[PDB]
Design an enzyme around this catalytic site. Sequence first.
Site, PDB file in Angstrom:
ATOM      1  N   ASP A   1      23.456 -15.823  10.119  1.00 38.72           N
ATOM      2  CA  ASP A   1      23.811 -15.938   8.738  1.00 38.72           C
ATOM      3  C   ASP A   1      22.477 -15.876   7.980  1.00 38.72           C
ATOM      4  O   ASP A   1      21.630 -16.754   8.170  1.00 38.72           O
ATOM      5  CB  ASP A   1      24.523 -17.262   8.470  1.00 38.72           C
ATOM      6  CG  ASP A   1      25.008 -17.375   7.034  1.00 38.72           C
ATOM      7  OD1 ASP A   1      24.778 -16.410   6.281  1.00 38.72           O
ATOM      8  OD2 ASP A   1      25.605 -18.408   6.648  1.00 38.72           O
TER       9      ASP A   1
ATOM     10  N   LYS B   1      21.562 -15.106  -4.139  1.00 36.88           N
ATOM     11  CA  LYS B   1      20.383 -15.858  -4.475  1.00 36.88           C
ATOM     12  C   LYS B   1      19.188 -14.919  -4.614  1.00 36.88           C
ATOM     13  O   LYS B   1      18.623 -14.896  -5.671  1.00 36.88           O
ATOM     14  CB  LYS B   1      20.222 -17.086  -3.549  1.00 36.88           C
ATOM     15  CG  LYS B   1      21.556 -17.526  -2.871  1.00 36.88           C
ATOM     16  CD  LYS B   1      22.132 -18.972  -3.126  1.00 36.88           C
ATOM     17  CE  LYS B   1      23.554 -19.299  -2.391  1.00 36.88           C
ATOM     18  NZ  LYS B   1      24.083 -18.718  -0.976  1.00 36.88           N
TER      19      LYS B   1
ATOM     20  N   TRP C   1      26.151 -25.306   6.896  1.00 38.04           N
ATOM     21  CA  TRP C   1      26.842 -25.104   5.618  1.00 38.04           C
ATOM     22  C   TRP C   1      28.276 -25.537   5.833  1.00 38.04           C
ATOM     23  O   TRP C   1      28.888 -25.164   6.862  1.00 38.04           O
ATOM     24  CB  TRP C   1      26.778 -23.639   5.216  1.00 38.04           C
ATOM     25  CG  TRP C   1      27.280 -23.337   3.844  1.00 38.04           C
ATOM     26  CD1 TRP C   1      27.000 -24.024   2.685  1.00 38.04           C
ATOM     27  CD2 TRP C   1      28.082 -22.211   3.458  1.00 38.04           C
ATOM     28  NE1 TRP C   1      27.637 -23.426   1.613  1.00 38.04           N
ATOM     29  CE2 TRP C   1      28.296 -22.310   2.055  1.00 38.04           C
ATOM     30  CE3 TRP C   1      28.646 -21.124   4.163  1.00 38.04           C
ATOM     31  CZ2 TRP C   1      29.058 -21.392   1.354  1.00 38.04           C
ATOM     32  CZ3 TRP C   1      29.425 -20.211   3.467  1.00 38.04           C
ATOM     33  CH2 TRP C   1      29.609 -20.340   2.075  1.00 38.04           C
TER      34      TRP C   1
END
Lengths: 401, 401
Positions: B214, B250, B133
């Site tokens: 993560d 999300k 990311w």
Amino acid sequence: SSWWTHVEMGPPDPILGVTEAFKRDTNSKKMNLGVGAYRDDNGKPYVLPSVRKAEAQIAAKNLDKEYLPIGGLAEFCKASAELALGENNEVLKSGRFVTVQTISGTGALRVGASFLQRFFKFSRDVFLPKPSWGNHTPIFRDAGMQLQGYRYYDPKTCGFDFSGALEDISKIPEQSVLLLHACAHNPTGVDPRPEQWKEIASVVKKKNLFAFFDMAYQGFASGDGDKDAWAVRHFIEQGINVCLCQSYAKNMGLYGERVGAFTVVCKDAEEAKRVESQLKILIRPLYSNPPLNGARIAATILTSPDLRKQWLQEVKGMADRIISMRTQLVSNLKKEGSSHNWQHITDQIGMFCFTGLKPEQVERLTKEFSVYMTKDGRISVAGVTSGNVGYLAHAIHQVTK
Amino acid sequence: SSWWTHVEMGPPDPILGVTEAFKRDTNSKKMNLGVGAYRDDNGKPYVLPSVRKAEAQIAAKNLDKEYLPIGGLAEFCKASAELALGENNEVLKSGRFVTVQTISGTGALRVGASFLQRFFKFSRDVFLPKPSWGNHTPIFRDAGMQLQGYRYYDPKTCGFDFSGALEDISKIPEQSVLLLHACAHNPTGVDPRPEQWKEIASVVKKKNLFAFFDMAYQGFASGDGDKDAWAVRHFIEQGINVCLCQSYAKNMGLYGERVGAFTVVCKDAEEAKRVESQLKILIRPLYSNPPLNGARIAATILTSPDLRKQWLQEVKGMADRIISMRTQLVSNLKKEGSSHNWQHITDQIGMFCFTGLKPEQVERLTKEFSVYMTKDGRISVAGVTSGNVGYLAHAIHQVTK
Ligand SMILES: Cc1ncc(COP(=O)(O)O)c(CN)c1O
Ligand SMILES: Nc1ccccc1C(=O)C[C@@H](N)C(=O)O
């Protein structure tokens, strides 16, 4: 071994300690004058009716929960700058400013401090009043800046040491950062009057110092948001391109929603464009984008004329309750036969009051009277009510007489 | 003449510069495959019904808006570690962990970064997979760590470069931090299989690396929370004391509410208390305390058996619609007459897909066909509908035949 064997226990939170000691006390007369938030005349949290109305009217609209831009809700940002500066300020009309939404006042200070670290090449020193909000130090320090001080509180009058402050500010090395509380100084409640601010602005401009305003209490301090923001505005009218921190925790009672903003007043719109891109580049690796809910509430209140009027009245009512309590406190001290000067109490402004009580007296107040406060003599006025103000006056008189 | 004259314009966002040539694109079958949030089969934002019900149960409770503790909502924090680890996890029964509420996944990443910076004396190096990311780099750089990399994505296969990953991880200096996507790697979609993880867990334990997970996609990745959390749970079960970042953006669709949590697993409960004291000292000067709305919602879902059960079946619907667009794109590419192996669109997991498309071909899809995606050949699978998937297969086939 373990990764974290060498990680020490941090110091106890001193305010949390007071509030918890308060919770355990079974004295029906107890008072929590360490509370860090507004309370009504019965000691309850207060959700502003205009906030409940705003929320209801948001819920009716069936909105998504999508990400805000890095700089937050565009209409919150604009309304928020309008509130701070006044709707017809030349700064808004020229658009020589950028405002970004932040994680409340703290968030705005932290994003300002990171912007100074990276871009304020002229200095590493931020000058804080003596004393200042406790968290100002670790904010600027973790941002990577250095802290200094200037005289502010005068412990002999429990007022503003104007002559020390002015002398100090006039010898701050040029192009340093000077942090200023816009109004309702925390923790003392001592504020400079308008003439004092003019003098301070004149030294600031003369010595080419950069003015960083912290404004957590517009409206909430006096009930009049234009009077509370007058200093900020005045610095701007004199040619000082300030940066500004705003918080809606107290004035809207949005504490846990975390609503605030950071504004840089710039030379022109083009410069504000460049400052904005750089604020975004700094905001993104802190938290990507700000929370939505509280900003929706604030924008709805600020851009709806009925809700705004109702909101201004409710703020005026909080400010009025606090002013009432200080007055009635001083009054009651006189009835008690106190012979000390207590006018600092009506002279100070906002929910925090430096009483002038000594640490031993504070300890008597906790032990004998169940009046809870910090050792520096700071009372949160929000814990005083008409029901308990007679008792507070009595207790204080007993420990001081 | 100005404080900010040397503040340069930052680079223009790609993900926002193309997303805005997209409206201007007039062609009627145009798709934006650069959106970074779930969309339904009609390309709309989706608010989970369980979120809607949690909101309404909360409304009825008439709750205040007072500050949370620095670490956030106790009940959210506890339900959240439970979601991550399983409610009968060893780690939770003994209390050998601390979980703090953060500003979504990004805030958990920054908070954890800043913890490493201050307390991880062993090293300044953070190994990210190649690629990771985008925001991972400035997050750790700004926090004051150094970035390193390890082979991850195999551009030949559009899958996992296991051997490369493992050689790289094997050569990481002992006591370095290794960041891992728990599932649904972003931006590529390429995750290790359970047997591949077992071997990463072996190197990590033997070479004494610190493992930083993560976890932004639990349940939303596969439809199955336990399967998505598996590798995290495995490492811990292997005697690895991980730290962990969660996001509910999300999986709960709580994007702009900013709901997340940061966990440190420790040797015992007394270590967790020390560590927690220190996370609090780091959090306070970032933003003092976390936002209320989202965490209240998340906590309500997770602590109600009925709602929690409903929410998991909504998470499964989103995962499934994504799996369905993945399988439909592959079949439709066959149907069109493509010769290439496209099983990677289907081995890949979560809403992001590295398609294997070269930069030229990306341009062709935008000009000739009006299909908007970033230059790396990544699409958002969420932007694929049953409506448009046919046309996408056609367009991709053309530029690749
Ligand atoms: C001077 C000052 N600045 C900033 C703040 C921070 O307020 P918050 O983060 O809750 O908006 C406060 C209140 N603690 C304050 O009194
Ligand atoms: N708990 C907070 C949450 C958010 C912002 C500030 C605080 C403070 O503690 C500061 C102020 N109320 C102080 O006198 O203590």
